[PDB]
Amino acid sequence: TIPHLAIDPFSLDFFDDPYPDQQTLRDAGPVVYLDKWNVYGVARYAEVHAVLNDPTTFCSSRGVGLSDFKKEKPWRPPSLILEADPPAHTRPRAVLSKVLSPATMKTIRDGFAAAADAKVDELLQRGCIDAIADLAEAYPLSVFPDAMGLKQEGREHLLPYAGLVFNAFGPPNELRQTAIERSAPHQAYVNEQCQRPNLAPGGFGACIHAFTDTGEITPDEAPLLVRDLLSAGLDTTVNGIGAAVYCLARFPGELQRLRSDPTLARNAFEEAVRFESPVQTFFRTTTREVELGGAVIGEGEKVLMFLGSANRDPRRWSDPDLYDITRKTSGHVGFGSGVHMCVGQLVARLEGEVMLSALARKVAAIDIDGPVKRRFNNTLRGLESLPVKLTPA
Numbered sequence: 001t002i003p004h005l006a007i008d009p010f011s012l013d014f015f016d017d018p019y020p021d022q023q024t025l026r027d028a029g030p031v032v033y034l035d036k037w038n039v040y041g042v043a044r045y046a047e048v049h050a051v052l053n054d055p056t057t058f059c060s061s062r063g064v065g066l067s068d069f070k071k072e073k074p075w076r077p078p079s080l081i082l083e084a085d086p087p088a089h090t091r092p093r094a095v096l097s098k099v100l101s102p103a104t105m106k107t108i109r110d111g112f113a114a115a116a117d118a119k120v121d122e123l124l125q126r127g128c129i130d131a132i133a134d135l136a137e138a139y140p141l142s143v144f145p146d147a148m149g150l151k152q153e154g155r156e157h158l159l160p161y162a163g164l165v166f167n168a169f170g171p172p173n174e175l176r177q178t179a180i181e182r183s184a185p186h187q188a189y190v191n192e193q194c195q196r197p198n199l200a201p202g203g204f205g206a207c208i209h210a211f212t213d214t215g216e217i218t219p220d221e222a223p224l225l226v227r228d229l230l231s232a233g234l235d236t237t238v239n240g241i242g243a244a245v246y247c248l249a250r251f252p253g254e255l256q257r258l259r260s261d262p263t264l265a266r267n268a269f270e271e272a273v274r275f276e277s278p279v280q281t282f283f284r285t286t287t288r289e290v291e292l293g294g295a296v297i298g299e300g301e302k303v304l305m306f307l308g309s310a311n312r313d314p315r316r317w318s319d320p321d322l323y324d325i326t327r328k329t330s331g332h333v334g335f336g337s338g339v340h341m342c343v344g345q346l347v348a349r350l351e352g353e354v355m356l357s358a359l360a361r362k363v364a365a366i367d368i369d370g371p372v373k374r375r376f377n378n379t380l381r382g383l384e385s386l387p388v389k390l391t392p393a
């Protein structure tokens, strides 16, 4: 009763243009079996949402990549939050929820917005820029490592480590295998910076360690929460912002709508997350036999969730392939849903809001002006190089 499909969702040809294959996955049925990797797949909105919100049956503690932690050793010690189930998940999650809390956003907003305005003004002095290197990567590198309270030395390891993290969720294809081999120096840098002495007081990393006084985490749990942030907090926003600029470069009507009301900047960013879905996929593992979408899947099976496809499902979104900055975006699964919903979403949305605010107020047009090159990663969707022309307002 379950369709068997040969599509490899981690193939370069797939990354290069996933939308035809994503419809095939949706229209084949509510649940598919992917023979290439021996996993179940869900790519419609209703099923992806249901699986995200059924944690006792579709767990995260056996890994959210292809690899089943009950069968193989994880390539690094498991996250106490992303790769954990309640009740173990709950208290460390609450620490990150408080460290990256609404009150914390107040302490960083003026700096983050100032850095966004200054970058766009800088880029307008150049004219010819690469919106990935000079913008999508440059701005988060200028705000987020400082907000973490990281020292200067070694920051050149941050994006290499993140590319390794996100590739490692995938199957053992060349991308994953090449990322993990000789990754020791990236791991050694990050793990060192997770230790309390190297984290500047008043920063995210120091604040995490400060919660060891409360009883929510032990001193030995704090470095792995810092690692959570060092794994997910930079590269996600780079492709988040990169997608936003790509969307505005391709939908001039929507850049003009944003220009005429900069307060749409926050929802402009949310719609970019839905539209491009910088985080394409995560896995769950079944803890028991379960019927999903009229299909019986056994215990101990990997289930691949197509978050991007779920955000483009015509059963849920009208005109899903249109970028619409006034779309009612709530319910999209670009940040997950349920108990593991992105704990960093306030930092991501703040970085996205203020850079898009800067664009809205300062830029009149954004024209692609050179060869566009895609960046392939087993989990992340984004560009390697986006040469654009910035016309001042």
Ligand code: HEM
Pocket (backbone or CB within 6 Å): 060, 064, 081, 082, 083, 093, 096, 100, 228, 229, 232, 233, 234, 236, 237, 240, 273, 277, 278, 279, 282, 307, 333, 334, 335, 336, 337, 339, 340, 341, 342, 343, 344, 345, 347, 348
């Ligand atoms: C546009 C940017 C981002 C996107 C699209 C994104 C996406 C996601 C998604 C889909 C999940 C769900 C994982 C799952 O259900 O298995 C998640 C969780 C998480 N994210 Fe975000 N993220 C972004 C930015 C950030 C930032 C800025 C941080 C930290 C500063 C962060 C840190 C985390 C952490 C620690 C988790 C695990 C939360 C948990 O398991 O409870 N992410 N993210």
Ligand SMILES: COc1ccc(C(=O)O)cc1
Pocket (backbone or CB within 6 Å): 079, 081, 082, 083, 165, 227, 228, 229, 231, 232, 236, 279
């Ligand atoms: C959204 O992607 C990630 C990746 C890593 C982690 C983590 O290391 O905790 C969390 C979310």
Ligand SMILES: [Cl-]
Pocket (backbone or CB within 6 Å): 076, 186, 187, 188, 190, 191
């Ligand atoms: Cl590590």
Ligand SMILES: [Mg+2]
Pocket (backbone or CB within 6 Å): 075, 076, 077
């Ligand atoms: Mg090791």
